[model samples]
Target chain A: KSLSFMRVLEAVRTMLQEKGGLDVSIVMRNQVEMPTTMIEMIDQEEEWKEKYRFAIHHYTNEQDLAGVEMIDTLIQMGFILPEGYKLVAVRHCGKQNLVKENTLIHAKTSFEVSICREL
Target chain B: MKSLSFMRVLEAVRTMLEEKGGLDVSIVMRNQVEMPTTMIEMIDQEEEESQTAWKEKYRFAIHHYTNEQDLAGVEMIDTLIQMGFILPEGYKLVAVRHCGKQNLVKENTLIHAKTSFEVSICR
Candidate 1:
């Protein structure tokens, strides 16, 4: 019988869930080869699906102070769905360095408004 | 304690070297917390030395050429590496595609080679 990539992915996902989050590398090797097309595809899809529940916004042009204000507005306007959802921010230097000349603040800011609900 | 990103990179390299190849992710985490300052410094120096020894050349785009039920472009990378058409280190199929026509060709080629390396000796 021929082994299929999808089958391998299902097996790994099941194993991870069963084991309560086993090492990703071990999961990949035990089920199939490393750095294979199947593994890459699975990882990419996993990354996307993991973030699908949240809304993400990017602010490439805003100054740090303005970016804070934007978040404040979201909080004030009741755009946030629930009270537990807090704002987290990170600065990406690579993006800032690459496009510094074009933007006023030359900073890349990523914002995530996350609310955790028990599954 | 002084915090440095370069120190983090060094710790990572030492951990990988000491563990002799394990899951890449675990190695990444262990080094940050467990390794010694001296070991981290040594590994960082070694990494810099190794970086000086090699030069990166050529830019290749990855295109996934086929998403058919049974075929994939990744298999082609494995096959070519097995066949000795290209060196495994520093060579990678960076892009791949399974749907839509390739701008260079109509049929899905599964994989195609682009760029070749050139060696030089100077007086």
Candidate 2:
């Protein structure tokens, strides 16, 4: 969970260094719901969900990259990342910081969001 | 393209309320409603492939805000009060207050008399 949290912070830092600023929201949870289909009948069937041990959003914006910086401070103060939630990066479609449609990375430590790429 | 809708913020607020036990929150209904007048009509008059009434065609779908803050560990209600939110005329703040967990009681609902501006949840 801490690793995922750090990776997200790193991704935002990289974006901030590349671009001037960015906007994002972080939602924390340990379980993410996933869809599934099966030809079985149970009396009480529950939807499938994925759980993570760590999770944690506060949106940050302005002339400065204040949002991620606040998070960086939190980590410096030894705040552990909560698990099981998704962090969505909100992008202004009209802006110039567009990424390739396929560059959204959903790996173990990385969450999907509008991302920045190297030129 | 149009700017973000007011509904988007309300949705975020609702999510936070639900996460923090919706029944435990208090809100004040303000007489302010900020509408997207220009954008709504701009799209309304624009020509599109489908010959339909834009007024009737608009539907509610989930959207994200460019500036989003994850208020996870904070006291959801206290922060909102401290920040001061303007409730629109078109919608009631109570609607958001009771967004989920339907059962409400008098004790759970009170006029948080910090300021004449609005009410709050007595925690």
Candidate 3:
């Protein structure tokens, strides 16, 4: 809760003002490994769906996915306005100012403000 | 890597689990923490290329999720897939959070996502 949602939003806007519409991902997560209220929700099996899986058979060739590289680089590099750099997928500037593109530890910031509110 | 990379990995897993034959596979929101773990542990026990492959592939999906923002600069959707929080087929992990005071209830009613997605566990 210490991280101001407004600060995060402002940071994004600043980045945009200074760096153009650079790709930025607003990621969110829980402070706890598992929040209690959430636990009960998923325990309900019938209320959910079984996830759709795409089959290799669905596409004839690699050309079907030949258009994703541009976005991939964008994900890896959020602070890279016009410069070349990397930032974590979720939190890039605050804790990960000098961090690399991918940090296995996930992130300290999050995009799930509604979850925070409802929880 | 390409954005379709995760999609490729997902398809590979379904194809592997299908013809390869195995327990169920699932999807959900990426930010979800618990169900992703349970989903994997719930997968029927096994030892083979399929299980191992599915493990890695599915894990990748769980770590990413659908971005709630306009920035496509993250692998949010892919991770969401692995977490099994994709909605519909798989239920999202949510909690009833208590906020400031009785007056805060209005904003705290529901923690929702940008879109609706279904979960699936293929043959």
What TM-score would chain A of each candidate receive against the reference chain A? 0.22, 0.21, 0.24
lDDT of 3 by residue, B1-123 (tens): 111233333444444433434424332223333221211111111111334222111122112112222223222332333343221232222211112111111112322222222222222
Interface C-alpha RMSD, model 1: 15.0
Evaluated on the second chain alone, the candidates' TM-scores are 0.20, 0.24, 0.22
By summed lDDT, the worst window of 10 consecutive residues in model 1 chain A runs over: A43-52
For candidate 1, the C-alpha RMSD (Å) to the true structure equals 20.8
lDDT of 1 by residue, B13-81 (tens): 334433543312221222232221111111121111223343222212222222222223333322232
Chain B TM, cand. 2:
0.24
Candidate ranking under TM-score, highest first, comes to 3, 2, 1
| Interface RMSD, candidates in the order listed | 15.0, 16.2, 14.3
- Model 2 interface DockQ: 0.01
Residue A96 in model 2: shift from native, Å?
A: 25
Q: Can you list the residue pairs that collide in candidate 1?
A: B62-B95, B62-B96, B63-B95, B63-B96, B63-B97, B64-B96, B64-B97, B65-B97, B66-B98, B67-B98
Output the chain A TM-score of model 2: 0.21
> How close to the true structure is residue B23 of candidate 3, measured as C-alpha lDDT?
24
By TM-score, is 1 or 2 better? 2
lDDT (tens digit, per residue) of candidate 1 on A1-119: 11122223333334433443322221111122121111112211111011111111222443455543443343223322123322132222111121233333332222222222222
